[PDB]
Design a protein around this ligand. Structure first.
Ligand SMILES: [Ca+2]
Ligand SMILES: [Ca+2]
Lengths: 754, 753
């Protein structure tokens, strides 16, 4: 488990305390999170538990939906999309119109009674240790505060230290926008309460937050709702949190007992022993991947200045830091047994956050988990798998209540209560492909891990999704294909006064992949030979990929792209086949790839943080390193990245962080088809470097080293053996490896050889 | 009544919220204060009430002091100084050794529900309005928060505004290191408790802090110990506070009822009515004086950067801003009926502040009130006069119990409980001149105002001080003068292993002024005996010039053999400033000797030490040396980003000494004369000043250009004779009551106009 870079190269640091939330630094263990401001005399730690949402179990299905569905479908086939959207909002959409928001737990307040003559201030976050440290000089003493969240102890650990005796004096309190009661003793604090209502859905959750002090020296007392510590030698605060949430339909947990159990269990330990356990668990996952894109003197600059000055072309390491920040954030927001990374990971200080900070699944949640497999963090996918089994249940209800159809269906959003209906507005959400796109991540887990028992476990999910579309696909009267109706291209207006339509190109691409996967699983598992044969015939009937009058790949069945209202729409939904899919690629479909390149050129480069991140991956797939680097400059910029390196929609949306990590990876290594492509989109700004521990499909890992803009060496390690193909700059090399063996590759007189 | 500068020329402003206490901005009405951090989503207002100290009434007098006093005196006359100090600490010093500290009331916590996409941030403090304003843009809406403390309604007013409807959502809490309990209703908050003990003295004070919300729109609720406001159009918070303190021996007040009566009275008014009343009261005092030292583009810079760049010589207006900051701080920390400005004014967030944040009267509290008269703020002296009336009572007990002498005496420190004995250590505190030096401010009140009824009121204080020294002065067996014993020169070690000695030069200068004042008041009031004060005054140790041409700090020529040649105190220069006992005109030789003493000491010291040297060089009519001192004072080494003076740490004395020194450079009033631009530096080639007060009941307006006097206007309030002096040229004038005389230059001659 060797380190993956120099200690300096993986730290975010600043010369001043934070003035805004988007300057505070995040720590987390997958389910318990904290934002650290680094205050000197008055410090605030803003906390989250990843099951604290408003409301309770509910059913937003509209009882009017199934009745009005045939008329919406007939209006769309008649080309009266504005009337169909109006009718859909009236009768089809969910009631209530909104889903439930992710909400903050509270803030830990640390108020020291003196801070005289401050010098040499530094607050930092070390990605290798997941510790937020604040340090300064006061008088003759060095004062230090360290915060981290351990997945083993399931506690936030806060240590207040000073290199002179009797220098820790403060009070400790809890502040929260949630209702409840705080009880305070010398022995510690407890904050117990219930969540609130939202959109008429009453709050049925209970929560508990506990604060336990461990004081060496001084006096420990209690005043009002706060702990008081006078002239102590060292203080360690341990914090645990939980809710009563058990399932989307079950809220009978005991957060009071669970938090107390974790505290007394963890209180039996010593801080060096606490630290060794946290470092071991965190570093077993973080140190799996090492990346080096170059080093400069700019590594000495504080992180905020690096973001402001990255456009100077003199700080290659900031791209590598951004890459590892996404791997870090996925580790800290999505561990096995926790909730999936929502729109903000787990970090949120707003009771009514933007778009409820839930799971928007017409691009954003998918982008969150894009970097998982290639960056050796497939265990972080477990929450998505668990959520998808939940959506199999609720989505079955939705499929039968809205469409009177078998199988299961999900639209463009879901929350902690796993609702699967369309919400907000038909022009954004009347889109039945949410489950299909989320399932693409599970297919990658099969294709990367090749665990046959896993495929057996996840196949019923793919079957049920296929069954829904077998029953819902319709013959299109203008084109003659089997299409979806009602649907939409997220989230674009077509040239005829609405967004709803029949068989948008994204639906055809998603179902082409879904049906191919169901057929391949039927052969690999020896079941459902029939239905797989009919999925093949139904697959041929889907709307085909088409090239329009401007040489562009068509977003809709009809050649509408050049007369669409917003030519630079942030969504590029019809380019899904070029990325994240490889259905369209430069090798196997050169014409359609050139048409997708033309469509991407017509859309333009600038958009939201996630829109920029999607364009980064697309240009990486097109093997254009210089354009991909130009997109990366737009992503890592004062317009789209906060001083704490958070991605900006704006405001903060964690999707762009994960998409940027995946796009940087895609520029250096790609794995699709039967091949592995080496440095397909390497930009001139990265002439030398290395990457180690990347994963490819077929159960293998790759290490890469390059110099002068040219490949120097690569190592392919196969776990169980198999045949592979390496491709570099148009040259291919067919290999065969045994289980647990390594094949080194290199360049000899400009030829790719072993 | 008209403004005294452009609005932007008298504001402190910054691009970012404060990270430390010394970056927060102060507001106050004399007794109720707030330090404003300017936080965006999480703001703190740190609060103070100027009667909240630790402890309670006590008597620190040592019962072993009188018995050991004759041996301390004989040991000093025998030149055994170290042993006298040790015996004094053992038997003479106060018990407990320390006095009580000034302590913070608590913090108001304003935690808002949104701060999305923040731009255009600015936090500021306007000296002309005494309002701390923080503004920024969120999305397309403008958010603003304003804080001020009104002296009429006796309330802190906090206004949370936004230019879009329903944009104010937050919670309001109270956090304090003081004990007590907070109760919470939708109708408001109350924090009631008792103070704590210090140095064995129990806490006998009770305090109350009330918060009254006034919410336009939205929903007003209470959760836990906090108020909750959701989606309001506008929020005004009213805050009142008080203690049970009544005087040094009475702690039976009713702060619970006082704060409630102030709140319900103020709640009957509108915010424009509240603001109008506050603006009228504050600007009635602040706008009396205008100063203009020049301008430049540097006025556009944030105040923190201006302090860092003042040495570049391109920001002359910073000195004028610093000068008016001192006038602002006195107005906001010392109004009639309030406590005097302590070591930190009224602003303090520490339970155990440096040197208890009390009243050190061997330079510091005097420096606080130096700028009062010339800058037209004599009303701010009332708390000092009130404290001096207290000290005549407790100082009488101290005089009888320590010295078995009549009259009253105070040493070098006092607190809210008005103790008058020596504390901490004999090498710093064994010094009986505290009340004598504080009385000099009261004489300036007489000399500036000439109110005869005021002289009758304050005369008993001057008589009582003279009576104590008539009874304690002793014949020095080595020198033959009448000297103080035991005493010291604050707080310098002499060449013989201690600081205690007999008849230090400062004591002789203070008593020469005190005896001349008591004699002159005897002739003005036709009472009393002044005959013996005249003979006793003639016996005091004279002003002497030593071997180095220096004014001697002690009776003997010891200056060149002292351990610390650059001591922060210049106590024996008191006669040159703040007194005029020695000056360039009447005592040329002694004035040149004080310059030599000042040159040997050097220019660098604490913030207050630099401020004293600034006034001293101003009195020596040396503009360039005075300006060199000012560059030491207004610098990153001695001034915080909020313009607070640095000892270090924060000590308000330097601010007031800086305001006084800048004034002394431009206008001086002593002797029978008024000196115009006596210490003008080349850095201020043109400018003006109006509304300054001079002795004899008159005011002066001044204008200069090209480094030379352009015009001066002398207005006499009730008539009298005056003499103006400019660059050694004099002009004798006689003005009637309420009349004005303009003077100017003609062929480099001071003439009338
Ligand atoms: Ca999670
Ligand atoms: Ca006061």
């Amino acid at each position: 488990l060797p380190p993956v870079a120099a200690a300096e190269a993986l730290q975010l640091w600043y010369r001043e305390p934070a003035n805004e939330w988007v300057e505070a630094l995040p720590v987390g263990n997958g389910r318990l999170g904290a934002m650290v401001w680094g205050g000197i005399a008055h410090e605030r730690l803003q906390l989250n538990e990843d099951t604290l949402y408003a409301g309770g179990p509910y059913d937003s299905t509209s009882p009017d939906a199934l009745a009005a569905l045939p008329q919406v479908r007939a209006l769309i086939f008649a080309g009266r999309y504005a009337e169909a959207e109006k009718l859909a909002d009236a009768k089809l959409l969910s009631r209530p119109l909104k889903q439930m928001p992710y909400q903050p737990l509270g803030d830990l307040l640390l108020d020291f009674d003196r801070a005289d003559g401050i010098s040499d201030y530094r607050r930092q976050l070390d990605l290798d240790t997941a510790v937020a440290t604040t340090t300064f000089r006061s008088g003759g003493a060095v004062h230090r505060r360290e915060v981290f969240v351990c997945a083993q102890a399931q506690c936030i650990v806060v240590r207040l230290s000073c290199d002179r005796p009797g220098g820790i004096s403060l009070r400790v309190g809890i502040d929260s926008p949630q209702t409840g009661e705080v009880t305070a003793e010398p022995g510690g604090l407890l904050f117990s309460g219930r969540n609130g209502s939202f959109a008429g859905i009453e709050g049925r959750l209970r929560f508990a937050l506990r604060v336990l002090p461990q004081v060496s020296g001084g006096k420990l007392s209690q005043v009002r709702d706060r702990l008081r510590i006078d002239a102590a030698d060292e203080v360690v605060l341990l914090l645990s949190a939980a809710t009563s949430y058990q399932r989307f339909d079950a809220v009978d947990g005991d957060p009071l007992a669970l938090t107390a159990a974790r505290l007394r269990k963890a209180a039996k330990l010593d801080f060096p022993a606490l630290l060794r356990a946290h470092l071991a668990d965190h570093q077993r996952l973080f140190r799996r991947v090492a990346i080096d894109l170059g080093s400069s003197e700019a590594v000495q600059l504080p992180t905020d200045e690096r973001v402001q000055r990255f456009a100077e072309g003199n700080d290659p390491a900031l791209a590598a830091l951004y890459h590892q920040y996404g791997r870090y954030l996925l580790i800290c927001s999505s561990r096995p047994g926790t909730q999936p990374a929502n729109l903000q990971g787990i970090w949120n200080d707003l009771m009514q956050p933007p778009w409820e900070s839930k799971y928007t699944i017409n691009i954003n949640t998918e982008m969150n988990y894009w970097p998982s497999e290639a960056n050796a963090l497939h265990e972080c996918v477990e929450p998505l798998e668990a959520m998808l089994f939940d959506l199999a249940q609720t989505g079955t209800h939705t499929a039968r209540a809205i469409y009177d159809a078998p199988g299961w269906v999900v639209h463009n959003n879901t929350d902690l209560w796993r609702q699967a209906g369309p919400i907000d507005g038909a022009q954004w959400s009347l889109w039945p492909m949410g489950g299909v796109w989320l399932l693409q991540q599970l297919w990658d887990r099969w294709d990367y891990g090749r665990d046959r028992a896993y495929l057996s476990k996840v196949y019923p999910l793919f079957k049920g999704a296929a069954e829904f579309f077998v029953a819902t696909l319709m013959r299109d009267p203008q084109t003659g294909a089997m299409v979806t109706n009602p649907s939409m291209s997220p989230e674009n207006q077509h040239p005829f006064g609405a967004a709803v339509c029949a068989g948008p190109s994204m639906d055809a691409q998603l179902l082409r992949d879904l049906f191919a996967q169901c057929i391949a699983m039927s052969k690999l598992l020896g079941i459902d030979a029939q239905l797989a044969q009919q999925l093949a015939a139904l697959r041929e009937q889907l709307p085909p990929n088409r090239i329009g009058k401007a040489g562009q790949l068509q977003e809709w069945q009809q050649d509408w792209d050049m007369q669409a209202p917003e030519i630079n729409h942030r969504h590029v939904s019809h380019l899904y086949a070029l990325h994240p899919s490889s259905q369209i690629n430069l090798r196997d479909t050169p014409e359609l790839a050139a048409a997708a390149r033309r469509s991407l050129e017509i859309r333009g480069d600038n958009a939201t943080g996630w829109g920029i991140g999607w364009r980064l991956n697309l240009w990486a797939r097109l093997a254009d390193g210089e354009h991909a680097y130009r997109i990366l400059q737009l992503l890592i910029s004062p317009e789209r990245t906060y001083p704490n390196l958070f991605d900006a929609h704006p405001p903060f949306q964690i999707d762009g962080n994960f998409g940027g990590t995946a796009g940087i990876t895609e520029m250096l290594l790609q794995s699709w088809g039967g091949s592995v492509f080496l440095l397909p989109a390497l930009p001139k700004a990265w002439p030398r470097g290395s990457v180690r521990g990347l994963r490819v499909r077929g159960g293998a890992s790759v290490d890469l080293e390059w110099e002068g803009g040219r490949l120097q060496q690569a190592r392919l390690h196969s776990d169980r053996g198999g045949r592979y193909q390496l491709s570099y700059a148009g040259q291919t090399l067919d290999l065969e490896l045994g289980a647990g063996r390594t094949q080194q590759v290199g360049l000899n007189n400009n030829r790719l050889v072993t």
